[PDB]
Design a binder for this molecule. Structure first.
Ligand code: GDP
Ligand code: MG
Length: 181
């Protein structure tokens, strides 16, 4: 009989008018757009700034989530960096079933971390698609992304099933708490 709250109300408690800018990144198919629509927090808008490169965005009050795929795509790395401007947090999403592409994801993740503009970011990892038989454990995704060895930044790896909205409250609550200090 008990019911979840709407993220709309959750965001009111968590951020409530505060200026927040998070970027949610990952390899294509990790589950990022799914997380966006599953939040139900406003319209998503897109800009395709090149014939290949493609960015999505959502804002609620003064919290903005900016979203793109990372990896392959020639190497459009400079076209991104504009979008890191005064970012508070990174959400990096991983397909926990895709054992093959995780080295790539760790590489990519590791490149975001080393970018100057990400020095002081809180880091949330969604180890997504945990519903799938034989996927990686959240620890195995932690290990692989090298989160043990980590700077002085606050980080957290969170199990998720994005298509059921599972894990999302937990990660976002961590993120919100972490960010207000
Ligand atoms: N089984 C499962 N499938 C998922 C999950 N999250 C996303 N997907 C599916 O993975 C595909 C890509 O998701 P999408 O959100 O477009 O990935 P994006 O490229 O990261 O934006 C879609 O078919 C989703 O339904 C999950 O947690 N479990
Ligand atoms: Mg997408």
């Amino acid at each position: 009989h008990h019911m979840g709250q709407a993220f709309t109300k959750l965001f009111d408690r968590w951020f409530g008018n505060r200026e927040m800018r998070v970027v949610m990144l990952g390899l294509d198919a990790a589950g990022k757009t799914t997380i966006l629509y599953k939040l139900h927090i406003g319209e998503v808008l897109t800009t395709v700034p090149t014939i290949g490169f493609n960015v999505e965005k959502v804002q609620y009050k003064n919290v903005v989530f900016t979203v793109w795929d990372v990896g392959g795509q020639e190497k459009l790395r400079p076209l991104w960096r504009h979008y890191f401007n005064n970012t508070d947090g990174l959400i990096f999403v991983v397909d926990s079933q895709d054992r093959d592409r995780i080295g790539k994801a760790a590489q990519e993740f590791q490149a975001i971390l080393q970018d100057p503009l990400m020095l002081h970011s809180a880091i949330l990892v969604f180890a997504n698609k945990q519903d799938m038989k034989g996927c990686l454990t959240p620890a195995e995704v932690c290990t692989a992304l090298g989160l043990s060895d980590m700077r002085t930044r606050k980080w957290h790896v969170q199990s998720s099933v994005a298509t059921r909205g599972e894990g999302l409250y937990e990660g976002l609550d961590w993120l919100a708490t972490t960010l207000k200090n």
